[PDB]
Design an enzyme around this catalytic site. Structure first.
Site, short mmCIF file in Angstrom:
data_model
loop_
_atom_site.label_atom_id
_atom_site.label_comp_id
_atom_site.label_asym_id
_atom_site.label_seq_id
_atom_site.Cartn_x
_atom_site.Cartn_y
_atom_site.Cartn_z
N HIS A 235 -34.50 -12.00 66.57
CA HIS A 235 -35.35 -11.25 65.93
C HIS A 235 -34.93 -10.97 64.36
CE1 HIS A 235 -38.58 -11.53 69.02
NE2 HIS A 235 -37.46 -11.00 69.82
N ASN B 173 -43.37 -9.61 72.83
CA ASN B 173 -43.38 -11.05 71.78
C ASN B 173 -45.26 -11.20 72.13
OD1 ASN B 173 -40.42 -11.38 71.30
ND2 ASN B 173 -40.27 -12.51 73.42
N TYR C 297 -30.36 -2.44 73.71
CA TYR C 297 -30.62 -1.70 72.31
C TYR C 297 -30.07 -0.65 71.86
CZ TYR C 297 -34.85 -5.30 73.03
OH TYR C 297 -35.64 -6.95 73.23
C1 HDD Z 1 -29.99 -7.70 77.47
C2 HDD Z 1 -30.66 -8.55 75.83
C3 HDD Z 1 -31.89 -8.92 75.72
C4 HDD Z 1 -33.27 -8.91 76.54
C5 HDD Z 1 -32.92 -9.35 78.01
C6 HDD Z 1 -34.07 -9.34 75.33
N1 HDD Z 1 -33.85 -8.54 74.60
FE1 HDD Z 1 -34.95 -8.11 72.35
N2 HDD Z 1 -33.15 -7.40 71.75
C7 HDD Z 1 -32.55 -7.80 71.88
C8 HDD Z 1 -32.07 -7.60 73.23
C9 HDD Z 1 -32.48 -8.48 74.42
C10 HDD Z 1 -31.26 -6.57 71.00
C11 HDD Z 1 -29.83 -7.41 70.82
O1 HDD Z 1 -30.65 -5.89 71.68
C12 HDD Z 1 -32.13 -6.64 70.01
C13 HDD Z 1 -31.52 -7.26 68.59
C14 HDD Z 1 -31.99 -6.25 67.79
C15 HDD Z 1 -32.57 -5.04 68.63
O2 HDD Z 1 -32.09 -3.72 68.04
O3 HDD Z 1 -32.63 -5.32 70.01
C16 HDD Z 1 -33.44 -7.66 70.24
C17 HDD Z 1 -34.43 -7.18 69.30
C18 HDD Z 1 -35.89 -7.66 69.57
C19 HDD Z 1 -36.76 -7.89 69.06
C20 HDD Z 1 -36.47 -7.36 67.53
C21 HDD Z 1 -37.83 -6.13 67.02
C22 HDD Z 1 -37.69 -5.44 66.41
O4 HDD Z 1 -38.66 -6.73 65.27
O5 HDD Z 1 -36.97 -5.03 65.21
C23 HDD Z 1 -38.63 -7.77 69.43
C24 HDD Z 1 -39.51 -8.22 69.28
C25 HDD Z 1 -37.51 -8.31 71.34
N3 HDD Z 1 -36.19 -8.11 71.26
C26 HDD Z 1 -38.40 -8.68 72.26
C27 HDD Z 1 -37.90 -9.23 73.33
C28 HDD Z 1 -38.77 -8.96 74.44
C29 HDD Z 1 -40.65 -9.09 74.46
C30 HDD Z 1 -38.20 -9.56 76.12
C31 HDD Z 1 -38.28 -9.82 77.41
C32 HDD Z 1 -39.72 -9.38 77.70
C33 HDD Z 1 -36.34 -9.29 75.04
N4 HDD Z 1 -37.00 -8.59 74.07
C34 HDD Z 1 -35.78 -9.41 75.96
#
Ligand code: HDD
Ligand code: HDD
Ligand SMILES: [Ca+2]
Ligand SMILES: [Ca+2]
Ligand SMILES: [Ca+2]
Ligand SMILES: [Ca+2]
Ligand SMILES: [Ca+2]
Ligand SMILES: [Ca+2]
Lengths: 678, 678, 357
Positions: B63, B136, B350
């Protein structure tokens, strides 16, 4: 190579942790089959921790770019002009890594943005790493490094909304250009085809600054670095670049990667202009001023050696993302000058690697390591990968017998400051009055372009300045353009509905210089790697036969042939749906496919009119286009493409068609298809 | 006043200072003489350049490309009968929010209009702590266990040797992963539909994806799904539009949002839930712990909880949008987790990943991350610690701070508490629940619920991407998986790539449908405010400018954003033909006074050959309302090959009648009869 | 090596597993996270001291400080484009780690302490009962030292409340030093049980005296004192003791000056009788009284001490050390002296020199 030792092969084997314990990584450990995940799942956390921390800060500038390995070979023993070891023998080979880039855009921005481009070269010499951190434009926007954040804040996206990406087409950029007139020379280059090069291979590299060549005897000369492309010079046109940004953001990196994989690794002659110290102020400007070129008519180029890129990286992150260039990576035989832009760069590139790497041991990354022993008393720091055996890392010492020993002009092939260099006067924050002509060289550049190249440059300014919302910035822009050329100010003013200021002839002149024009640089010296789209059909057995005959003839000559049809099969590389004229340097329709070009043609397999749009876009963008087969007439009519046009081909014979078409590929652009101001 | 006004810094007046308030200059380096070298004692230079050198932080691991805004959430009721959540405990109760929208795969400079899943992350700054819903625009996720996240993301991000291709699943690795990991089919079908290329962030929904719990103060729980339902309506781009828009305007979605807020058209969503009993976890024919499944609305209707409105843009993008650090661990009393193994692992990711972004542990102290209520805890020190803690006894249990802070739990201090009916039973296992094993029925449910043209668009997206997969094993494996959802989809996709579809396997085939997932089917838009009308005019006819002015007044009355296009700028003309493109408009109108610009012989140095007509043609082919206003429509419609009798093609002399018709066309938004069907 | 070594209980191998000890369970999280703070980036396992001695095969990538150049350009599972490698390792293939398959969980998801954890006092009392009388006194005296520096009267009272639950006698003896009364005996957890292996004083003579430190206090005044010290050195070094000869100034065979010497530098102290004059009632080369103070401190702290050469009364009377004390040696014979002294080094501490309540 410190890269060889660090290569990791995962072609076989069971999955392990980072400490070699065999594990799995596909299901979390849970309290029951529908239960919550356990904190004790170290397999989960080591894997997700690594993922969570994969990213590092992008470069503050030149974030978007791509690299390759190769070799530099000296043409001679250049001891007569420099002590530099990598230049000290005929045939002497030094490994290199080069990164090419844009400047303003972030990671993921398009290669074909209009911008200045980086050309950064590391020579892993036998006396240390030597970097020439250059651009594809020989002059810079600003005369003092302390202004770099002002320039870069102004061209990067507006900071309330971060709009627009990878573009100077906004008020803040043109505000800065119009308030800081030093910017005019680089601005003219960036508004020319040099802002949208056809590829990294079809652009030159420049050190920009005057540097010094220093002999072992202590004498010095002033030099400029020029890396002259052996592929020739070529540009996109702007409308084409804008589509290509969308259709293939990766175009330049793909072009470079494919050229290397196909055995067509690009080459440059590494050249210098050499002039005496006494000529610093002899050419009508100051050699310390990085907004000025030495016209080749005043100082010719000497070819020092060959740069060839011939090997792609194994891991883009480890090699390309992590390469950390510095103009501070200097070797004996080279010295700095008092160019205030270069002077401040030296501080920036050592500091910024702390941000990127997160710690001080960035020169230990394999891509940054040298190819000779390191002997110094630098110690500790986060990420320390060495185990130092000298437990007395201070100078002067007796407990390590005085090692490491000092290196200097008379010991250990030390770097030394050119001994003729001096400074005299007050400690000042003042600009040299010798820097004050901001407009004569922009005019020299503009004069040296062909009439259609002048038109392209005017049209780039008309495009960008029409998107400036401030009437007061647009007026100030015309004030500065008018000091370079009244005609440019008048032609740009016409697009934005303002009146140009009255002619101010202070800096106007008629002088020209060789070697700066793209359109003027004549046919390309090679067409190897250039892309030919053959538009065919699965409808007609004859159409695929015609395509296959063109393919043999064109592939013979090293062209990259794409046969396009409605659907994939034997002999067809790409569907109409995925094809675009931005993907080709020339477009051939086989007359067997004529029915696809009718106004009534429709298919669920590609967007309405796609086959004809490819042909029309290619024609309108200046590319060689033709129809091969016998009913050449019909397709040219649907396209409104005149059969008697320069760069339009119409032959029944494939042999005749290709011979004519390949000359058009060398010509590369048919500029008679662009309207000029009266 | 911004909710973050306490942190604002005004630079509208004053002299330049260092970061420690010393007045300085920043335009010329300090040198030893007027043509001398720069001095190390120049602290002005080094503090400015150090800051510049360290501006960048790592982009988000996923993202990375996105944009945010401030607003307000207002509760429709007292929801204490289903949740203890304070922000939902009274009719009209208002809570500030910040929302960020995003793509998933591209780096922070990549195009908004890539095909991808999109983020919709909402922070509620509640009076009992920050509560984040990190959602999402697609209600299901690719994978069933968080431990697989790096596998998915490595496969869809660029190939790691050359980092190609940007912001795209159209490469071998991605389709290898999809075809080997069949859980991906449901999200894959959503991403290949118009939900992959939304018209704007305002024209998409948000989903929490996971089942969560609502927990009452009495300890009882219900299972919930979060749905944020757009009050703007649902709309998509077409792919061949999205590809051009990625090049013409990489910032399209962030500009659309910014502009909507500035014009007082701040976007709105009903924040809704599906609410079902704990006993219904395995009642609907799938497992509510499985994040690859939706609860069809026919089984559990949406309950509207309140209004989300975004109405204030950030002041500094970096400080607010780039730095906002969402977490599903940001939970409040009244909400709880479920044993969904994807949600479970997210809770770890996160909290950890903010250490990478912020470089230290005090990231909750950044203004955009601070809560709007007091913080009482024994967290201490760490890099960047901003607080000056008075309590010199930060341990529990203590007497020397009188036992403060006090423990908060179900019975005291409004503590968070785990839903007390939750249990676990069974072996500690790394095993997948067999209840998760149907990867194909719900993708078929989704496909069945699209209109015929919508099904074609999804087939065409798969045809586009899979035709770019080089491996014949991967393409065959993809057809094996698609064939388990729909034999018809497999046959139609296979036709584009010259393979045979495998024989029908009807194990998971069915004809069930569900409401609310189709875009084409969701009827006309409820509002046309903010939609973009391009009026193509000419400076060559004062009467063409008069027509355009009359059209502007009437269209602007209804809240449309009007662009008048002509050859050059002047009063009443917003944009030149050179900078105009059909991707900039939701509808195109030609004033019949400009008909001469649509002639095949029309040429100008002021814009690319054929630009006026290409704008009209692209708009028609992409399905937009198009028309000619003034009564002479034949010359334009014939040049464009557009039939006067076509649906969404308007020809009227009367400006009022033209606008009434054309406005119904903008609400229809797309004329799907212009797309060929298999 | 030392500063950068980054240990983790998560560094586990096949054949070992965790338990549900809530202290261990949370440690697994801490040690992986904290290395991000120390290293500043995620590639801390690549530091030489942290690297394994077997190949690494996984799909971890990138991160600051990435040293590897990975050849596998398909680092996802499941894949066909890298032929399904790396392969998953588990109980049945590739010697994978596996969780003990008998382990289960059952019950509510709770933030509650097991009532089986609630006896905080019986084992402290088991430990205390297992110490020797002088060792119990040392423990009481450590608590009297520390608790006497606590400013809060209410904290001191609360400390005695808890100590009293282990041992009323500990509470009484500690209370006496801090001018408070102990609370009345609470015998809920009192008992007389003992366990082997926890006492230091009761663990008997050391099994080796190699490396133990012998300070020989000599003088440059008397060439015969340096001769005695050299003879003693030879005899003690033969047995692997670390000998320091101390005198007023350095010269061949003298290791330290009295200025730098201290009884804390030695496990045993010997005075050669040629140096007896230095043990009487001054010098710009060391603080007043230094030679005698090294001997007196060594004696007070329980170390073997003695005079070698035959004349002991002048030194031992100056030190107030009885010649018949256990761990006090006097012989003319270097061989005899060393035989007796070495037994004292193995005894290590003469605990009859410490007062008891
Ligand atoms: C095990 C890891 C993992 C999994 C399974 C997911 N994500 Fe995630 N996501 C992350 C690990 C992550 C992250 C690496 O932790 C991020 C990158 C930046 C942040 O703050 O968290 C992230 C960012 C991130 C953002 C951006 C937030 C922003 O605008 O700063 C969104 C909207 C989502 N994710 C949504 C989802 C949704 C709806 C998922 C499944 C239902 C999902 N992610 C599964
Ligand atoms: C005072 C600051 C400053 C100034 C005046 C310049 N730059 Fe620079 N440049 C940087 C500060 C900098 C930097 C912030 O230090 C970067 C970012 C990443 C890095 O390694 O250095 C950089 C990166 C960078 C790169 C990318 C190297 C790579 O591919 O990794 C190139 C090619 C250039 N610059 C070239 C130039 C040229 C030809 C300049 C003028 C003649 C110039 N820069 C002036
Ligand atoms: Ca701006
Ligand atoms: Ca050009
Ligand atoms: Ca750091
Ligand atoms: Ca020197
Ligand atoms: Ca790939
Ligand atoms: Ca659609």
């Amino acid at each position: 190579s410190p890269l060889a030792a660090y290569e990791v092969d995962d072609s076989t084997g069971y999955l392990t942790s980072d400490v070699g314990g065999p594990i799995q990584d596909q299901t979390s450990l849970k309290a029951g089959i529908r239960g919550p995940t356990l904190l004790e799942d170290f397999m989960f956390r080591q894997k997700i921790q690594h993922f969570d921390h994969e990213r590092v800060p992008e470069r503050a500038v030149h974030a978007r770019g791509a690299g390759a390995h190769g070799t530099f070979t000296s043409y001679a023993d250049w001891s007569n002009i420099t002590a530099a070891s990598f230049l000290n023998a005929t045939g002497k080979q030094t490994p290199v890594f080069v990164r090419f880039s844009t400047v303003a855009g972030s990671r993921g921005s398009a290669d074909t943005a209009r911008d200045v481009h980086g050309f950064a070269t590391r020579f892993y010499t036998d006396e240390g790493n030597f970097d020439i951190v250059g651009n594809n434009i020989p002059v810079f926007f600003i005369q003092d490094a302390i202004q770099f954040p002002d320039l870069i804040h102004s061209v990067k996206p507006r900071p309330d909304n971060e709009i627009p990406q990878a573009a100077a087409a906004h008020d803040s950029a043109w505000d800065f250009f119009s308030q800081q007139p030093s910017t005019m020379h680089t601005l003219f280059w960036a508004m020319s085809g040099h802002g949208i090069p056809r590829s990294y291979r079809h652009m030159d590299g420049f050190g920009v600054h005057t540097f010094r060549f220093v002999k072992d005897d202590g004498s010095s000369k002033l030099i400029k670095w020029h890396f002259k492309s052996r592929q020739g010079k070529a540009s996109l046109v702007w409308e084409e670049a804008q589509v290509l940004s969308g259709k293939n953001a990766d175009f330049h990196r793909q072009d470079l990667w494919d050229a290397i994989e196909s055995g067509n690794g690009p080459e440059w002659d590494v050249c210098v202009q050499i002039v005496d110290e006494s000529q610093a102020q002899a050419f009508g400007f100051d050699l310390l001023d990085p907004t000025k070129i030495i016209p080749e008519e005043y100082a010719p180029l000497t070819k020092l050696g060959l740069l060839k890129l011939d090997r792609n990286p194994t891991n883009y992150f480890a090699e390309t993302e992590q390469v950390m260039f510095q103009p501070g990576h200097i070797v004996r035989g080279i010295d700095f000058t008092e160019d205030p832009l270069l002077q401040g760069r030296l501080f920036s590139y050592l500091d910024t690697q702390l941000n990127r790497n997160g710690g001080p041991n960035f020169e230990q990354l394999p891509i940054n390591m040298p190819r000779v022993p390191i002997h110094n008393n630098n110690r500790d720091g986060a990420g320390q990968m060495f185990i130092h055996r000298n437990k007395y890392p201070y100078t002067p010492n007796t407990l390590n017998s005085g090692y490491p020993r000092q290196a200097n002009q008379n010991a250990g092939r030390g770097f030394f400051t050119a001994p003729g260099r001096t400074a005299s006067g007050a400690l000042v924050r003042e600009v040299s009055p010798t820097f004050n002509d901001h407009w004569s060289q922009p005019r020299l550049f503009f004069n040296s372009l062909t009439p259609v190249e002048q038109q392209f440059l005017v049209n780039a300014m008309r495009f960008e300045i029409s998107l400036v919302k401030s009437e007061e910035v647009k007026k100030n822009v015309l004030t500065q353009l008018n000091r370079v050329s009244h005609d440019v100010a008048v032609r740009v003013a016409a697009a934005i509905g303002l009146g140009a200021p009255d002619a101010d002839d202070t800096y106007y002149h008629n002088n020209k210089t060789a070697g700066v024009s793209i359109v003027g640089s004549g046919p390309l010296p090679t067409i190897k790697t250039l892309r030919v789209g053959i538009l065919a059909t699965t409808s007609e057995s004859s159409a695929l036969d015609q395509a296959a005959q063109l393919r043999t003839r064109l592939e013979k000559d090293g062209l990259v042939v794409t046969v396009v049809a409605e659907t994939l099969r034997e002999g067809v590389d790409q569907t109409y749906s995925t094809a675009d004229a931005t993907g080709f340097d020339g477009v051939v329709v086989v007359d067997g496919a004529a029915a696809l070009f009718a106004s009534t043609a429709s298919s669920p397999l590609f967007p309405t009119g796609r086959p004809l749009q490819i042909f029309v876009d290619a024609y309108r963008w200046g590319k060689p286009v033709g129809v091969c087969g016998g009913k050449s007439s019909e397709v040219l009519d649907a396209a409104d493409v005149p059969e008697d046009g320069d760069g339009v081909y119409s032959e029944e014979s494939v042999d005749m068609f290709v011979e004519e078409f390949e000359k058009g590929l060398a010509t590369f652009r048919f500029t008679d298809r662009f309207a000029l101001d009266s």
